[PDB]
Write an enzyme that holds these catalytic residues in place. Structure first.
Site, PDB file in Angstrom:
ATOM      1  N   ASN A  94       0.981 -35.194 -29.533  1.00  0.00           N
ATOM      2  CA  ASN A  94      -0.052 -35.839 -28.722  1.00  0.00           C
ATOM      3  C   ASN A  94      -1.159 -36.340 -29.638  1.00  0.00           C
ATOM      4  OD1 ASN A  94      -1.947 -36.774 -26.866  1.00  0.00           O
ATOM      5  ND2 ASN A  94      -2.364 -34.759 -25.956  1.00  0.00           N
ATOM      6  N   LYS A 125      -3.567 -38.171 -28.890  1.00  0.00           N
ATOM      7  CA  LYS A 125      -4.815 -38.312 -28.135  1.00  0.00           C
ATOM      8  C   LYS A 125      -5.434 -39.687 -28.415  1.00  0.00           C
ATOM      9  CE  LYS A 125      -5.200 -33.292 -27.889  1.00  0.00           C
ATOM     10  NZ  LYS A 125      -6.029 -32.046 -27.899  1.00  0.00           N
ATOM     11  N   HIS A 140      -2.640 -32.742 -18.821  1.00  0.00           N
ATOM     12  CA  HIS A 140      -3.304 -32.290 -20.047  1.00  0.00           C
ATOM     13  C   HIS A 140      -4.742 -31.861 -19.716  1.00  0.00           C
ATOM     14  CE1 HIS A 140      -4.689 -32.284 -24.286  1.00  0.00           C
ATOM     15  NE2 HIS A 140      -3.424 -31.993 -24.532  1.00  0.00           N
ATOM     16  N   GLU A 168      -8.084 -31.726 -20.716  1.00  0.00           N
ATOM     17  CA  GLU A 168      -9.335 -32.481 -20.542  1.00  0.00           C
ATOM     18  C   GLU A 168      -9.279 -33.421 -19.324  1.00  0.00           C
ATOM     19  OE1 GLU A 168      -6.873 -33.985 -21.882  1.00  0.00           O
ATOM     20  OE2 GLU A 168      -7.495 -34.483 -23.942  1.00  0.00           O
ATOM     21  N   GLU A 207      -0.367 -24.256 -22.677  1.00  0.00           N
ATOM     22  CA  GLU A 207      -1.425 -24.638 -23.590  1.00  0.00           C
ATOM     23  C   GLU A 207      -2.758 -24.033 -23.157  1.00  0.00           C
ATOM     24  OE1 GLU A 207      -2.275 -29.011 -24.276  1.00  0.00           O
ATOM     25  OE2 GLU A 207      -1.814 -28.221 -26.281  1.00  0.00           O
ATOM     26  N   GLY A 209      -7.776 -27.447 -30.116  1.00  0.00           N
ATOM     27  CA  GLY A 209      -8.713 -27.990 -31.111  1.00  0.00           C
ATOM     28  C   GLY A 209      -9.779 -27.036 -31.627  1.00  0.00           C
ATOM     29  N   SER A 235      -3.701 -25.482 -31.306  1.00  0.00           N
ATOM     30  CA  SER A 235      -3.892 -25.183 -32.734  1.00  0.00           C
ATOM     31  C   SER A 235      -2.614 -24.891 -33.521  1.00  0.00           C
ATOM     32  CB  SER A 235      -4.933 -24.068 -32.933  1.00  0.00           C
ATOM     33  OG  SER A 235      -6.160 -24.441 -32.330  1.00  0.00           O
TER      34      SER A 235
HETATM   35  C1  LIG Z   1      -1.772 -29.609 -26.798  1.00  0.00           C
HETATM   36  C2  LIG Z   1      -3.052 -29.911 -27.507  1.00  0.00           C
HETATM   37  O1  LIG Z   1      -4.004 -30.620 -26.744  1.00  0.00           O
HETATM   38  C3  LIG Z   1      -3.207 -29.451 -28.918  1.00  0.00           C
HETATM   39  O2  LIG Z   1      -4.371 -29.793 -29.621  1.00  0.00           O
HETATM   40  P1  LIG Z   1      -4.513 -29.111 -31.043  1.00  0.00           P
HETATM   41  O3  LIG Z   1      -5.387 -30.099 -31.783  1.00  0.00           O
HETATM   42  O4  LIG Z   1      -5.148 -27.784 -30.722  1.00  0.00           O
HETATM   43  O5  LIG Z   1      -3.101 -29.015 -31.557  1.00  0.00           O
END
Ligand SMILES: *CC(=O)COP(=O)(O)O
Ligand SMILES: *CC(=O)COP(=O)(O)O
Lengths: 249, 249
Positions: free
Chosen positions: A10, A12, A94, A96, A166, A172, A212
């Site tokens: 992802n 983003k 997802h 957010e 998740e 993040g 993460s």
């Molecule tokens: C699934 C997700 O939004 C992962 O974000 P990350 O930067 O913590 O991997």
């Protein structure tokens, strides 16, 4: 034996044409020699560039979101539009989006149902907040999110469903769930699917961990019996996404 | 004398690669021989196709929406991302976004400000609801929306601003505002801009009308002294968009 693993990127709201061309070349040159479905989800405007440049045979392209129907929805991209341009994977629910763009359990479940009806593979995101975990509500929360989705799905639609556990606190934040933490939730999710949907569906269901994930922690997460791969944010923008793919060997 | 007119196509959440290729060919083959800025705003995923096929020298490509900054915003497209792929026009504050996706006056004004800072031409949408008009609040409403935007803009940023007066009751309802109705609002908007921003800014400002514009009603709307063109939904998906462009002669 575990079903086919998934390593999903992802991206983003990130990328330039130059950065994407470079990163896609890295992904192309990484020769993958085991059975795994790789997934890259770029921003909508970057989908055609990725379609044009990404050639690694282990990869498919996904949307990061969609609405169910075309029409007078300025700024939005519909499922028929994605299908027509050759995108048949979508990430839905997802965090957010759930938290800030109004996507309730009902709304997410409806989106998942419509995507399945339109022949999409769906990565449906579930997970508890930090407060929910502290209150020992993790199981209640993820089962509630999962059951909401399940209520709008026929049994056969589950062949198109991928769950992504998740936890919101791991997105993040540089605070990955431990293998034990992740496995505990994956185990209870699969048990629920086994009992409510079917033992056959449960055996084939990919349940991915997200939050993460990086090159160093991925293998020990994948070693757990009910983790079938990863939904990767930050690390998927980097060459170390190769290592995460290889951690599903 | 009127500033350069604009004929803007908001395709909303509509199109296939086949339909877009056909419609773009129609637009390409339509030879335009007066000074006008044509604008096509496709869905994000269709932007590269339109970039590849649209060749008419009178046209620019616009996004239908954007967020200000790149980052962890799954499903969204940022202004730096658009700028990098060569899109430097954006529609902001469109009505269904204001009404259903939470875009308040403050949020729209902030988006407009950030777009101007990032070098975008902006089509900022304003307009009253049916109830607001019935309560004789039209002037109050559009001036409030305009002043919110103005409060975040330097005088020089207005060179990048295009206002679109689009009464909510006229969007997709087959009930166009009459030339007299539209002109009345355009006149009061321009007076406000003249008094609050500057006489120079007011003279150069494009104020477009939107809401059920079609090939048959466009010319008589354009004949009004303070209407500088159109923001077109439904009719912009059809060959009659050619006629709407030509109605700005
Ligand atoms: C699934 C997700 O939004 C992962 O974000 P990350 O930067 O913590 O991997
Ligand atoms: C500006 C706008 O949303 C117009 O829609 P229409 O279909 O009424 O032209």
């Amino acid at each position: 034996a575990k079903p086919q693993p998934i390593a999903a990127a992802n991206w983003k709201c990130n990328g330039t044409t130059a950065s994407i061309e470079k990163l896609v070349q890295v992904f192309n040159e990484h020769t993958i020699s085991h059975d795994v479905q790789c997934v890259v989800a770029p921003t909508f405007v970057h989908i055609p560039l990725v379609q044009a440049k990404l050639r690694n045979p282990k990869y498919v392209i996904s949307a990061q979101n969609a609405i169910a129907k075309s029409g007078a929805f300025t700024g939005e991209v519909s499922m028929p539009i994605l299908k027509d341009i050759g995108v048949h994977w979508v990430i839905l629910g997802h965090s957010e989006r759930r938290t800030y763009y109004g996507e309730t359990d009902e709304i997410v479940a409806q989106k998942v149902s419509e995507a399945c009806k339109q022949g999409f593979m769906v990565i449906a995101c579930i997970g508890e907040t930090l407060q929910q975990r502290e209150a020992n509500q993790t199981a209640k929360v993820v089962l509630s999110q999962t059951s909401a989705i399940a209520a709008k799905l026929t049994k056969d639609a589950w062949n198109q469903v991928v769950l992504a556990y998740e936890p919101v606190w791991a997105i993040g934040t540089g605070k990955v769930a431990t293998p034990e933490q992740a496995q505990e939730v994956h185990l209870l999710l699969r048990k629920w699917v086994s009992e409510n949907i079917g033992t056959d569906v449960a055996a084939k269901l990919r349940i991915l961990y997200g939050g993460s994930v990086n090159a160093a922690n991925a293998a020990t997460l994948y070693a757990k019996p009910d983790i079938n791969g990863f939904l990767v944010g930050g690390a998927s923008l980097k060459p170390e996404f190769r290592d995460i793919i290889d951690a599903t060997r």
